[PDB]
Design a protein around this ligand. Sequence first.
Ligand SMILES: CCOC(=O)Nc1cc(-c2ccc(C)c(NS(C)(=O)=O)c2)nn2c(C)nnc12
Length: 114
Amino acid sequence: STVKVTEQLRHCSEILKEMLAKKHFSYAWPFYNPVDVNALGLHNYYDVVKNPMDLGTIKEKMDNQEYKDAYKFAADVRLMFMNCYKYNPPDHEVVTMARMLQDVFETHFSKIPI
Ligand SMILES: CCOC(=O)Nc1cc(-c2ccc(C)c(NS(C)(=O)=O)c2)nn2c(C)nnc12
């Protein structure tokens, strides 16, 4: 509602658009949707990951205006990467893709106005 916050969220929407861009598909695609625990066979996933997150949910939460400011948004993004890091062994390819995508995110998020 404040302009400061309104502008923070526009920047966040732009950051979300960036990581959804075809440019980053080859390492962003597993984060477009929730981890499909059943289809994949990850019997321990919800034991390890108490709060799943994914880019499609973040897009919908933004669309529903559920982020009060930029840091609430960054927390969901960072939760998504942390979930990947915590569940997978460090050399699984999805962890490399998560690091790559997180470097995209933090590069753009570090420019948000102070
Ligand atoms: C030791 C093996 O553990 C794992 O396989 N880990 C992960 C696997 C996959 C994954 C694979 C294949 C597909 C088709 C998808 N797409 S979907 C509909 O689930 O989002 C996702 N995503 N992932 C994400 C995030 N975070 N960790 C993993």
